Amino acid sequence: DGLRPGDVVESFRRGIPQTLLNEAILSVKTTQRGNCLPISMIPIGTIIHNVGITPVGPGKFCRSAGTYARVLAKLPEKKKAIVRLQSGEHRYVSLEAVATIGVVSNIDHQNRSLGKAGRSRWLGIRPTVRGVAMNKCDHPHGGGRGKSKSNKLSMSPWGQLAKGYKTRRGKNQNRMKVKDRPRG
Amino acid sequence: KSRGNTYQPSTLKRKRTFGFLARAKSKQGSKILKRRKLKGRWFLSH
RNA sequence: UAUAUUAAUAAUGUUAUGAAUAAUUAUUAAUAAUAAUAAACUAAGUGAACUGAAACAUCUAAGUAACUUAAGGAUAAGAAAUCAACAGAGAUAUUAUGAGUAUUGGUGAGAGAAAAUAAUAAAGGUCUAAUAAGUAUUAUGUGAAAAAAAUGUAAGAAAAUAGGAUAACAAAUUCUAAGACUAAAUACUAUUAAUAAGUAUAGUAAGUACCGUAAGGGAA
RNA sequence: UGCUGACAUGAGUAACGAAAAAAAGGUAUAAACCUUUUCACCUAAAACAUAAGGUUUAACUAUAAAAGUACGGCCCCUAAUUAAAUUAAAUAUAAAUAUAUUUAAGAUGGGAUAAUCUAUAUUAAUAUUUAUCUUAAAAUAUAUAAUUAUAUUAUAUAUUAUAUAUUUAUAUAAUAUAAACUAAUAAAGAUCAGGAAAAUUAAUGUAUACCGUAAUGUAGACCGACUCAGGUAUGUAAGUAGAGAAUAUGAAGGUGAAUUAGAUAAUUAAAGGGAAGGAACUCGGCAAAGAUAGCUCAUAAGUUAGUCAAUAAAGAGUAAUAAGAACAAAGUUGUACAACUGUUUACUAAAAACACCGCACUUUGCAGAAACGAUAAGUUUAAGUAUAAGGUGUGAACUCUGCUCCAUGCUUAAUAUAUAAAUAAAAUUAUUUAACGAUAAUUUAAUUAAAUUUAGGUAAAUAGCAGCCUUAUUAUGAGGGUUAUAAUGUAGCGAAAUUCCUUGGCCU
RNA sequence: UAAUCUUAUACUUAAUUCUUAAGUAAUAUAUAAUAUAUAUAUAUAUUAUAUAUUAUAAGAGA
RNA sequence: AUAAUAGUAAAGAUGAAAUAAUAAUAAUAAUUAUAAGACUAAUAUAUGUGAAAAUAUUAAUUAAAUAUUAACUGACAUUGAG
Ligand SMILES: [Mg+2]
Ligand SMILES: [Mg+2]
Ligand SMILES: [Mg+2]
Ligand SMILES: [Mg+2]
Ligand SMILES: [Mg+2]
Ligand SMILES: [Mg+2]
Ligand SMILES: [Mg+2]
Ligand SMILES: [Mg+2]
Ligand SMILES: [Mg+2]
Ligand SMILES: [Mg+2]
Ligand SMILES: [Mg+2]
Ligand SMILES: [Mg+2]
Ligand SMILES: [Mg+2]
Ligand SMILES: [Mg+2]
Ligand SMILES: [Mg+2]
Ligand SMILES: [Mg+2]
Ligand SMILES: [Mg+2]
Ligand SMILES: [Mg+2]
Ligand SMILES: [Mg+2]
Ligand SMILES: [Mg+2]
Ligand SMILES: [Mg+2]
Ligand SMILES: [Mg+2]
Ligand SMILES: [Mg+2]
Ligand SMILES: [Mg+2]
Ligand SMILES: [Mg+2]
Ligand SMILES: [Mg+2]
Ligand SMILES: [Mg+2]
Ligand SMILES: [Mg+2]
Ligand SMILES: [Mg+2]
Ligand SMILES: [Mg+2]
Ligand SMILES: [Mg+2]
Ligand SMILES: [Mg+2]
Ligand SMILES: [Mg+2]
Ligand SMILES: [Mg+2]
Ligand SMILES: [Mg+2]
Ligand SMILES: [Mg+2]
Ligand SMILES: [Mg+2]
Ligand SMILES: [Mg+2]
Ligand SMILES: [Mg+2]
Ligand SMILES: [Mg+2]
Ligand SMILES: [Mg+2]
Ligand SMILES: [Mg+2]
Ligand SMILES: [Mg+2]
Ligand SMILES: [Mg+2]
Ligand SMILES: [Mg+2]
Ligand SMILES: [Mg+2]
Ligand SMILES: [Mg+2]
Ligand SMILES: [Mg+2]
Ligand SMILES: [Mg+2]
Ligand SMILES: [Mg+2]
Ligand SMILES: [Mg+2]
Ligand SMILES: [Mg+2]
Ligand SMILES: [Mg+2]
Ligand SMILES: [Mg+2]
Ligand SMILES: [Mg+2]
Ligand code: NA
């Protein structure tokens, strides 16, 4: 977020090097914004981004503009650390997984308004044709005289319900989630 | 918009699509060639 | 780059100190290469629909068309864990009778054996296996319109004192699975010969002309 | 409405495909061929160069001439993409095949040297898009070093005169139009943030391969069945004029044609003019007519503040007063619908339909959601990570968006609650057996799902928003009492693109 | 958790390379003995015996 | 608000009652442990301070502030539409 040219950032993903070791006391020095480190080092409560899953793999979660996660708890017994992601889903992440300190840049990205259709086209976004505009053969919402919704439940062109229908369900669900994201 | 001129020649494209070697290279094209040979065709491909 | 290397010699000219280093020609020895291959017939895999049932959904069309794969001059099958019925036969293939009979079917449409007796047929019997286990059998899901032998999932035997065969059981009978080979009659193509109440619009050109981007269609 | 062939009929009818021709002569053979002269047409083309294409049509068989420099291919290199190719076991798969990775191919692109003319081999060794302003500098004139006004301002070459290497080289100075245009340079604005891939010295080389080259190419030589007013890529495109590639003309070049000659009724087409009237036409001003500068000024209400409205309407200056080329320029307003620029039925609909930017809902934590995959591996999503991506509705913004979960769904919680397959062992029964046994069914015992039900939640999910009675002198109905329901139409709007009765009543 | 699954990344003999076998050197693990330090247990060093040269790391996990 | 601990059937509310993200999925009360905002008990009298709105947890910075003397200026003041 507040990073500007001239700032200095380290990374303690390998570990605390012999420079800083020779010269908590270390935690406050380390937990400056912009520098990366394992969630074990990152104190409980503080805001982070580019949160990893595994102790070896890269930062996956919380990458987009003005997004962030928050460290909620850490369990050295199970080698996990409960982290709240941007969605609000509380989630187990490996205790030795990587995460940068601070919120992501460009918080005001969301407030941008594209002026015109052409801007969307430039960005690489072709037009969405509504299901109600289509013929019945093309989309369930299609058909009807005048403009009608056909008494048809809001759903995709391939019949998957659009409003509220949980798509990841049953056995195939997320094992690592502690508390599901706030919904509606 | 007047129709009729759907053929728009370009030798290179023709040879890529309908040339002998294109037929030979594909399995389906090889089968076509064989079928034409069986029929008795003088001209198997472009 | 095979009118090639690589090496060994021989002849030629140059470099540096009789010996050494590169190039060109000519012999000798060494090193790799050329898929244009049928089609029909056979076997295997996957497998429609129109259609019929005066509708249609089981059923039918049909294991057909088609696509796919693989083999041989043919392939397949073949010397009974076969049939039969207390008498007997005694390999497989094709045809005639048996017989449109038994059998079976939304018991509709319709489908339909075998034994036995005849031909055709070739010498038609003969070991190649240390005699066969995740096999027979069972449950279950499928499976040639009758008649099974197959098969995914999983339980799973027996030694000839045994095992297979029929709703079931008892008697009897018959055969020996889980190892094998096999001409001949047959299919298709080509050739030769002979016979045509066949063809000159089924009588030789041309898969050409021409049509189509193309698969493909196709004259006189 | 049989098939094939032949021949009729309409009929010597229509038509002969945008078109400017004339004479003389080749030739006592020419409307059509060739030549000469005249006339016309195209001229940012009907010209000249080319690309693609094609029955070589060409100025032709005695036929389209390349080592390379404002020459192309071939070649080297790669993009998009392609590949019976590539890796006891790359992965997946009824077969076919498919996937991932390698390698190979693949131009529409990149590729050293050159008029001083230039040398490509072998061996060895370590670059989206647009812009060039302002300032500043010096130069030229007016006025009294400094002000005012005007052009000029990075590069492109010949001449002359100097200073150094020695008439050939290097540097310096001075001389020298305007308007376009090119390339190469420099600095730099905007978000939409801008390909890929293939070293250098030295020595030794270099006898320079193949293919393209005609003509046609806004067309009679290609794609349209035709010598078809259609379709067809690029570069030059004389001057005069102009803001210009508009428009007029046309230097040069090319062309004047498989139909001609006459006549020009009715009638049709495509044009020109029109008294008096001026929409009386008609479904409807359809069609036609209508431009008192195009430059410089000036330009309102409204408004989302955007000269949006505007190119405002009117109007002014310059020009012209009787007029006297073409081309650009064709009013003002009210309402309905849609924010807008866009898109759409190639060949009857361009719209009020689609899209849109914005708004809202929702799904998915990434070994995700979505889609594709006889079905997989896997691929897109994404080299992204919830301010992201997919799905759904609505459709910029202002003022706003009421009440309702009954139903269909979704969503959360309850052993509330049934039933499917799957199992031990053991009881009668039935069949059989002389007997045990064997074979069938049937019934018992612990451990049961999702579903369903119930109760919430969810309407910018799918959806819904009743009727009767009668009370303030008559009327109206603020009120009052009922039934029904999940709730009972709120704000607004209203004979609406929604109103049948209906040409509703009233006003303009 | 060696069920499953996901992700990432030397010499010598015998039949120039290729493979077998023997012993030796090198590393790792398991077992036994000896010595030393701390609170019957843990750590370090040395010696003997046995095994290995798809792996390691991370994650999910009956 | 979340989590843990142990613990038992009610809890919370009100005039009295119910509805609810209350409670036999184990709460409330209790004890711990994290986080989050927003407020400032006594002193307090708004005493005082500020032009008025205002203004009382602590600290620092910068600004402005009282009285009396000494010296200086010499009416430079008051009020104040717009
Ligand atoms: Mg849309
Ligand atoms: Mg439609
Ligand atoms: Mg549908
Ligand atoms: Mg409607
Ligand atoms: Mg055609
Ligand atoms: Mg078959
Ligand atoms: Mg029928
Ligand atoms: Mg019917
Ligand atoms: Mg059948
Ligand atoms: Mg055989
Ligand atoms: Mg049959
Ligand atoms: Mg046997
Ligand atoms: Mg046996
Ligand atoms: Mg069975
Ligand atoms: Mg046998
Ligand atoms: Mg055999
Ligand atoms: Mg007839
Ligand atoms: Mg006539
Ligand atoms: Mg006539
Ligand atoms: Mg005529
Ligand atoms: Mg003449
Ligand atoms: Mg013009
Ligand atoms: Mg290549
Ligand atoms: Mg090219
Ligand atoms: Mg040419
Ligand atoms: Mg030429
Ligand atoms: Mg030309
Ligand atoms: Mg033409
Ligand atoms: Mg043509
Ligand atoms: Mg035509
Ligand atoms: Mg001109
Ligand atoms: Mg001229
Ligand atoms: Mg011409
Ligand atoms: Mg003509
Ligand atoms: Mg008139
Ligand atoms: Mg008049
Ligand atoms: Mg009238
Ligand atoms: Mg009228
Ligand atoms: Mg008009
Ligand atoms: Mg105004
Ligand atoms: Mg005009
Ligand atoms: Mg519009
Ligand atoms: Mg149309
Ligand atoms: Mg139209
Ligand atoms: Mg549309
Ligand atoms: Mg959008
Ligand atoms: Mg809106
Ligand atoms: Mg999916
Ligand atoms: Mg979205
Ligand atoms: Mg809409
Ligand atoms: Mg059951
Ligand atoms: Mg209405
Ligand atoms: Mg006061
Ligand atoms: Mg206080
Ligand atoms: Mg005052
Ligand atoms: Na509809």
Distance A27 CA to ligand 55 centre (A): 61
Is residue A96 a contact partner of residue A41, using CB atoms and an 8 Å limit? Answer: no
| Token pair in block for residue A67 | 């997004």
User: Cα–Cα distances in Å, from A134 out to A8, A141, A147, A152, B10?
Assistant: 56, 7, 10, 14, 38
Residue A29 φ then ψ, to 5°: -65, -45
| Token pair in block for residue A28 | 């406050």
Nucleotides of D under 7 A from a protein CB: 52-54, 83-84, 96-97, 192-193, 222-225, 230-231, 340-341, 346-347, 353-359, 361-372, 384-388, 390-395, 408-412, 457-458, 461-463
Distance (Å, whole) CA A128 – CA B2: 32
Given CA atoms B18, B24, B26, B32 in this order, what sign does their dihedral have? Answer: positive
User: Cα–Cα distances in Å, from A130 out to A102, A121, A154?
Assistant: 40, 18, 11
What's the N-to-C CA distance of chain B in angstroms?
30
Bridge partners, residue A71, by sequence = A83
Distance (Å, whole) CA A57 – CA A100: 14
Long-range contacts (CB closer than 8 Å, 24 or more residues apart) made by A74-83: A74/A39, A74/A40, A74/A44, A76/A40, A81/A39, A81/A40, A82/A178, A83/A39, A83/A48, A83/A51
Q: Which nucleotide is nearest to B37 (CA to C1')?
A: C207
Distance (Å, whole) CA B25 – CA B35: 15
User: Cα–Cα distances in Å, from A10 out to A7, A19, A36, A80, A144?
Assistant: 10, 12, 7, 24, 63
Q: Which of A154, A105, A99, A87 is nearest to A7 (CA)?
A: A105
Residue B15 φ then ψ, to 5°: -70, -40
The resolution, in Å, is: 3.8
Neighbours of A91 (CB within 10 A): 23
Gap from A26 CA to C194 C1', in Å?
115
Is residue B33 a contact partner of residue B24, using CB atoms and an 8 Å limit? Answer: yes
Gap from A134 CA to F52 C1', in Å?
68
Burial of A34 (0-12, 13-18, 19+ CB in 10 A): middle
Distance A60 CA to ligand 29 centre (A): 63
Burial of A12 (0-12, 13-18, 19+ CB in 10 A): middle
DSSP conformation letters of A50-75: SEESSSSSPEEES-STT--EEEEEEE
| Token pair in block for residue B29 | 């094209």
| Token pair in block for residue A93 | 């992440």
Distance (Å, whole) CA A67 – CA A49: 7
Q: Which of A112, A111, A137, A139 is nearest to A123 (CA)?
A: A112
Gap from A138 CA to D482 C1', in Å?
53
What's A74-136 look like in SS3?
Answer: EECCCCEEEEECCCCCEEEEECCCEEEECCCCCHHHHHCCCCCHHHHHHHCCCCCCCHHHCCC
Experimental technique behind these coordinates: cryo-EM
Distance (Å, whole) CA A68 – CA A49: 5
